[PDB]
Amino acid sequence: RTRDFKGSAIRLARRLLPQRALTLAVILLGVGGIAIGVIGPRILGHATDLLFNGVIGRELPAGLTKEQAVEAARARGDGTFADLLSGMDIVPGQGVDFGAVGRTLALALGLYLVAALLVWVQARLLNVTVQRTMVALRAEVQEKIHRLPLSYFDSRQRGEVLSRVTNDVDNIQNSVSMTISQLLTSVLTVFAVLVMMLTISPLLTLFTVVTVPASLWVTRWITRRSQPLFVAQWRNTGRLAAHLEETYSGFTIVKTFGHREAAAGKFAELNSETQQSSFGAQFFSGLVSPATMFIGNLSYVAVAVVGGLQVATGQITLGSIQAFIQYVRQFNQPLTQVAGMYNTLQSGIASAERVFDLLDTEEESADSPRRADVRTGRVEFEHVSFSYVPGTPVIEDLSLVAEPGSTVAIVGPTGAGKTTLVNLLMRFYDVDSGRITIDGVDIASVSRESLRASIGMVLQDTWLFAGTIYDNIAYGRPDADEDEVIEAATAAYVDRFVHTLPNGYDTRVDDDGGAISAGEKQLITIARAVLARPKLLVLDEATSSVDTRTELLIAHAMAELRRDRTSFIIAHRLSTIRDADLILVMDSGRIIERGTHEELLARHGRYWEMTRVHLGGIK
Amino acid sequence: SNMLWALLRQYVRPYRWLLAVVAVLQVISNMASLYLPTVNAAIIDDGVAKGDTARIVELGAVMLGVTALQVVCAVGAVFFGARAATGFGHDLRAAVFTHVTTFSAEEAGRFGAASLLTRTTNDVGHIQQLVQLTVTMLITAPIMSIGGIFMALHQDAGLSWLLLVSVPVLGLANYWIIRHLMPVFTRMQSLIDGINRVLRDQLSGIRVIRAFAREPLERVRFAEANQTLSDSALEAGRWQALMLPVTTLVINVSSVALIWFGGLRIDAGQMQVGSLIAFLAYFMQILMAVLMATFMLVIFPRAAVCADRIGEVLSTQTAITNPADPVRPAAIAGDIGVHDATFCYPGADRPVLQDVSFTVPRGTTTAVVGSTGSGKSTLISLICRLYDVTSGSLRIDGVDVRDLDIEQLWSAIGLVPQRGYLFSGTVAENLRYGRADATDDEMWEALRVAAAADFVRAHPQGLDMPVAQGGINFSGGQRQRLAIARAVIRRPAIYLFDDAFSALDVHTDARVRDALREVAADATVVIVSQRISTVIEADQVVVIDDGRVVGIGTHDTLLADCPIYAEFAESQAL
């Protein structure tokens, strides 16, 4: 839940502030439009006063005094009637004076036009401001994402940052744009209608303001009652989603073995349960508006009857009551929305505080534009003891030396630290103790844009964006020619399978119908790495899902045939690694031994042991 | 635009009689809400200007009764509308799930489970929300307007023409605004989806985004998407900002004209003052209902694209179908025959599998090996008919697989796919999928055969050790072994292994295979493999490259005659 309200709201208002006079003008136009929209019905009530005065003065005998007319009415009885006559400006026998009514209505119509124009202009300006600030926020979030160190993405949960960066800004939009318009107009409207009501009469004003405690209490009570049903619906929909995930993801297994009907029955039971829960929750959620409308309508009964009886006493005129009734309706109208928009406002405030906490996260140290270059690929390590967190030494006393023509291989069990090794070589994380140098150049004093753009690196998993396979391969080097992409592709044997797809090199790899399994995913990623024309290739177990024949063909063609560049190879299959230039055996975060295939065959140790796992699997 | 209505007018049909009752309840509640100003006119008319406070209090009691009726009818309307919307959502979810159940593997892969789940639950909920909102909130404005015209006719219809001309102009203005706004809203929703896709893609592979130092391209793409979304949202905001002021101005100008014409009628003596108050309150109620209803009109485009996405699923007929005249043998042995079969996706330049002609004897272990992407992954699905043969024929025991009863075939086929998966619950629950009635002794025998007993026995819960919803809590090798054991307790005529042995340790694979031939040598075993060590022991070996058969025979003959298998073996050997 939310942890900071005042600070988050203050900084959101500050984010909308920098236009200064523009925001001030927006608020001023809103205040204006509200004020004129409140004054209007008072002028209409004055016109109704004139009409009522004329119609009730035409009845009395002409030429009499108003006090004389009241006395004459009282002499025959009708005390309430005479008290009424005493309550407005009238002269017996006078007409309705259509000229005064006409000019009053002309003033009212002009004011209504002015108020409509002001409200429209205010809404336009506020929309422009909200979209401008939202573009600014999106740009700031993008710059942040491209400036965060990888430690945040590593430490943060899998499904948290995506909703923090994508859904939260949408909540920011649907919060700021809705509230800063509607809540502000509603608060100004209720306050202006309240002060106008107090100007008219306070005794009725009390009867129109007693609703707010009652309406707020009713809304809070209905929320309290709805919370158990809401959580029940949430849990039932969660169970339904879990069962649907089980059925859809493992569709082959459920389709086979004849368990289709059992899954259908389980879904039917879960669907009935979630139907019941959703019915209850939605009923109690929608119950709020009729209740608050009922409270306001009861207030309407109260104000109508009290105004009628008090006019019968002559304490006020009829037009004031007509305006007062219109104010009562205009007072209730925003209350229902204001009661329910508190949840949206606080959701937006929580999303804003989360996004600003993300934007306040410390950034990785600035680059040093040394503009390093590679000529021999002499990658050397010395006394590296990097660890993710103060604690276990994930990397310990690591040291190695490469060769310009070497395709050196790092092999070990899962969780040894090869991925963190290549990550450190990518400067994704800092190194505590020891130093990393390539071609005699310390990469710690080298800008990352100059470094990573020349190495070339592939993860075990594959990242493919919502583009065609052609764009996916061309991402390695967009400046590459059209046929250079096809050459790099056929170098990685993706062309061996791509033509079997419905649309060769044009398939939406995000929308693909599952025809691209993990091995061909890795083939596509390898092709993308090839197209970048790297000179310091490393392969973090992109070796996994592909077959060994295609493995060895690719490895040869783009690491051993390309003698001008050194390479790093990581693979769990020792076959794919055999006969490579220098082999590094590493365990427990440190290199156990190093040498060539014949050397670690000659001396029996760890490497001989995993060679005795697959073929000579003496268990 | 039209798909949503083509879905509602189909899947709300069972609830027509309930929508009728919610409509009449809403009508009565709105009519009482507009009747309150009518009796207000009465009390100001013959209570005021006459000095009768008894009439004042009597009409006050009448108004209290009217508002009580209004609240009871509104509460009933909300209740029945919530029931109708929830039932519609339930029916739509059931129908969508039932239609998805009949899908083959081809269309399921075409849609994707990660999107099919949301398309079957959240994109049904989005339409349910719109149905409930339009039942309980949106139809208030048209009902308010019609009731206002009716009450104007009831209350001195001599001026009711003012309302009769005012309401149509308000409706025309709002309809024009809605018509010019809705396509902009749909485009804005699509662009929001696009920018969310861009952000998700950037976040998923930030490591590889920085690996290629392609930050400027990502910044340019995000800036372009954000700017076009901003332009669409600005147009939508323009149309929405030119929306409330128009309605407010129309209502206020109509009210001013109402005051003028009411004064004119009062001068002639064919009008009374209270009717002016009643008419003004009618206008205020109409404005309130119109604002409260057309505020929510952002929901409609989202539900429209949502219903289009659901209709994508609901309009896709399954390619796989029972022949409706199925061959019904008493049992089918382990004789698999493939004759010149080919398989290709529509529009593909080259087939993914072609010219396969291998066959297996009654009981035999046959292993098919090939390079990645060379159609090997589809042969297993073709045998058990996940997909269907485009050209050629595949037959089981001499009768075509497309003519055999598919359910009987699956009952006789023990398959473990490369898409390894498990269901929630205990290991006994997942293992129960094999037979659903086997005793625990048979399950233990299965784990012994699958080499999974060695680790599952150490758990205190034994067969009842809980598993993850997606099987994540187990390792890949353990997942494969559990799927193997699930296959073992079926006693099927043909075993279908879809590279399940690839992820296992070689010694574990050897012990699993020797145990399997110890228990079920008579049953035919078909293995697609990526590793040679699981192929040498097979009686018959067939190799496919580039989607076509390149070799067949025994292992040693494959070395002697097949250069491609020779390369495979020399690359696999240590």
Ligand SMILES: Nc1ncnc2c1ncn2[C@@H]1O[C@H](COP(=O)(O)OP(=O)(O)O)[C@@H](O)[C@H]1O
């Ligand atoms: N969030 C994390 N992600 C990855 N590894 C982590 C994390 N936190 C701690 N570690 C440790 O860092 C080590 C990295 O090992 P890794 O490079 O993945 O080995 P391999 O390359 O063989 O898979 C692991 O042993 C793990 O214990």
